From a paper:
Pectocin M1 (PM1), the bacteriocin from phytopathogenic Pectobacterium carotovorum which causes soft rot disease, has a unique ferredoxin domain that allows it to use FusA of the plant ferredoxin uptake system.
To probe the structure‐based mechanism of PM1 uptake, we determined the X‐ray structure of full‐length PM1, containing an N‐terminal ferredoxin and C‐terminal catalytic domain connected by helical linker, at 2.04 Å resolution. Based on published FusA structure and NMR data for PM1 ferredoxin domain titrated with FusA, we modeled docking of the ferredoxin domain with FusA. Combining the docking models with the X‐ray structures of PM1 and FusA enables us to propose the mechanism by which PM1 undergoes dynamic domain rearrangement to translocate across the target cell outer membrane.
Author numbering:
A (entry chain C), B (entry chain B), C (entry chain D), D (entry chain A): 2 to 268
Write the structure that this text describes.
């Protein structure tokens, strides 16, 4: 019947019955896959065939060997659920053996895992491992799982209003920097400084009593610390590793909203 | 509510309700976990809280930020599935920060991965990565998913019978070695030589016509290749990785039965 | 060893070592369970043994069959963690079988569940089901989750001051009625009219500019509507239900504080 | 991280990630839901937000007031586990009050309880209440918590071998029926007859001494007794409750393995 296709390029999954070409099913789901011709006679749509059976008798550009490892998405019907990696044109031309592509494949594992970072004590070293071997695919951790303890008095753009003596009702919509050292050793060992945004209402009475009610969201944070920072957060064993292995920066998505409330009395 | 508790100390999983102290449940399952005071007031039962949430109000002494990274198995109620590492009294007694334990945690990162190996082009590199990060924990792959293509003619303890000229009905129960180079590049790139066992009935008629009906099962395969073998299977990149990061041997369980039938004519 | 005892009367928990009678351990932690003889010689201290194991060889009043379901707290040592329901002296005095205490035990389930009301569109019917089967135990919902949208113009004790032409600074501390129809159909469908309290400061300048800044808390609300009101709120089916099944009133606790502020100009 | 979305239209329950729209996550699960646009524009996606919180900022159609009760599922992220009902669109007319849905929602209130049955004296009445309000969702209790006391003499497929006079070593793999009246009043009051399976080795020496070693597992049990059985197990009160509120059969999962040993002498 219908089989699921996972494209490791961007970690997207789309349905495809056994009478639809893989490329058309992808476009049907709004996906912009590569193609030049559309008749099984070039390599513009070539994808790695990581796992699954495909019927590509319509394919003519790949021979018998390449068909064991690659698939023309415009000319192939699925026979099972499939994993593919689109956009690997340079690979097909230079392909020699499994051996010669195994390092590239080992590098795809990080992106094929769940994007969600491991929790607890694993989160910072999971982040560092993905830096070493993940080749830039995004990871994620909900803002509610990061372990932040944000007090209103730690939010400069709100305290900026309070401390200038203003009185009244203020619609807050501000970015601010959060040094997660204030929050705990776990977030401080892979996130460091992060950019947050708060939206809400600050009320300040004639006599300086204030309240704030709103939410906090987080921008994606770029994991690209230098070795000196890795040494501060993880220790000099990280420096010995980075002396031999280069990291690849990637984004940590931090979805969700953190509710925030606070009250105080000025001066 | 019961939850899953893995102790990467010996990689054992046991059941524990939200009313059971983790030390008691593990003692139920006959496990030998460290303890001394059994009263929430010493460092002998302390495990790392690598993942999960717990109820440690009877713990008392932790109290500090310590409670987010340590758990007292004699006085803790599981509020979730938990990865824990017993035997860390030394880290509790003298950790300054995450810096001191990050390298230990890093090497343990695959210790709670699912056992099933990835399929297809991923299987050999998945097996290699688990060698580096798996903490010696089991992987598995069904014998029907390995990609084995065995003819009876490649089974010596059966062919040894046919070629001696015997005539009759043989109950076969024989181990034999299988070099999966014969089966394909994928199994050859992480299994190499495996030991199989076949059980069945071999019939040889007076005129030399023969047939065999049976099954094939596989013993657990130790993944422990030396650097030369990895260099052959994967290439020279594997050597730099293995030098810096250490491999821990683990077993690949190959459950299931593979059916086999064959027939021929001796002369 | 030392164990935990949970008395379903109030859902109170306390410790009890294996060499302390349940009753004594309860008093040593501030509780006040019934007793008279304190010598295993009546039913003043009897409790249902929901679960757990006790040594009550000192318990004369209970025969072996009764000791499967009941425990004399002055005569029993905990062998394990225990859930009990004290004060059930009559239950025993009429006991004959599990069958004959099952309706009573069913009526304890509502009190045993979490006291927080379900959310959203389940809140009004969760409240009605607890009315039917909860036998009077408290429920709760945080004032912030009720769905109140209160404007100072809806608070008569504040508006009465402004509307009389007064000028100055008023310390406010007043109860007032909140018809939660003003707030939304969910609160209107189980809370109806509730009593709130506000404390804060009303300042009215000579030119009639005014502002109010304070907080709002909620008294416990007694859920005790008559069938006419249930029919208004839930529909005719509730009258069919109430024609065969009686409710028991219970209090809904509404903890927390809401921030309130308002501004206006009298002319 | 990832939340359970439960849709009342099919009693279906499917995961949805914090960064994924509810409709997309439903499409990936195997579900078919209504969709006309996908920019928050129409109402074909609209669902009733029964329980939980969503982020609907991308959505444009619904007013701030309708967002309290309605969710555009192609444009909404879950903030929490959610209960919705898809296949709604007419209700936006404003011709359905809370009164019109209240009886429906009341009847499935137990449908999101955790699956583990309560222990001890509560188990039978917990099972009965789930029959009334659980909407057919599963419950569970570990076989080791049920209170079974099975002796090998009560296992007919083992005694059958012993009693025919056989001598040797036998692999046992046999279903058999257990009337839990044999085990205790609690299991007899909600499980009744259950089907179990035992796997193990029975050895019988020439002199008729026998030993059995193995384990026992339980099949899922359907809770669907008729009003007569409920009266016998709980009493007359259960019939009036059952008449008014009605039962929905559901399965009780009984996981785990119960170890069993027997020793005897055939003589
Ligand atoms: O600005 S927020 O959506 O990250
Ligand atoms: O843990 S690393 O330094 O091999
Ligand atoms: S686009 Fe040319 S082969 Fe598919
Ligand atoms: S054994 Fe001492 S704290 Fe647990
Ligand atoms: S007080 Fe009399 S039996 Fe306990
Ligand atoms: S399909 Fe139109 S808003 Fe969802
Ligand atoms: Cl995969
Ligand atoms: Cl309060
Ligand atoms: Mg950062
Ligand atoms: Mg091998
Ligand atoms: Mg009221
Ligand atoms: Mg049954
Ligand atoms: Na959000
Ligand atoms: Na929050
Ligand atoms: Na439990
Ligand atoms: Na080396
Ligand atoms: Na106002
Ligand atoms: Na329950
Ligand atoms: Na058998
Ligand atoms: Na009903």
């Amino acid at each position: 019947a219908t089989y699921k296709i996972k494209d490791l390029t961007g970690n997207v999954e789309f349905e495809c019955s056994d009478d639809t070409y893989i490329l058309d099913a992808a476009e049907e789901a709004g996906l912009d896959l590569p193609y030049s011709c559309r008749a099984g006679s070039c390599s513009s749509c070539v994808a790695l065939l990581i796992s699954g059976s495909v019927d590509q008798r319509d394919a003519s550009f790949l021979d018998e060997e390449q068909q064991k490892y690659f698939v023309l998405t415009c000319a192939a019907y699925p026979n099972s659920n499939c994993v593919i990696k689109t956009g690997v044109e340079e690979m097909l031309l230079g392909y020699d053996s499994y051996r010669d592509m195994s390092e590239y494949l080992f590098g795809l594992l990080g992106g094929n895992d769940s994007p969600e970072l491991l929790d607890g004590l694993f989160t910072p070293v999971d982040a560092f491992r993905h830096y070493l071997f993940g080749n830039g695919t995004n990871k994620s951790i909900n803002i509610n799982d990061v372990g932040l303890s944000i007090d209103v008095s730690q939010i400069p753009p709100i305290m900026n209003i309070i401390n200038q003596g203003f009185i009244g009702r203020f619609d807050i919509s501000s970015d601010f920097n959060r040094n997660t050292v204030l929050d705990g050793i776990i977030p401080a060992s892979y996130l460091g400084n992060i950019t947050l945004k708060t939206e809400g209402v600050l009320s300040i009475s004639p006599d300086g009593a204030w309240s704030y009610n709103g939410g906090i969201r987080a921008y994606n944070d770029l994991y690209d610390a230098n070795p000196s920072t890795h040494r501060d957060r993880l220790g000099e064993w990280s420096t010995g590793v980075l002396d031999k292995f280069n990291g690849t920066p990637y984004e940590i998505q931090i979805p969700g909203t953190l509710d925030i409330s606070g009250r105080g009395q000025r001066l």
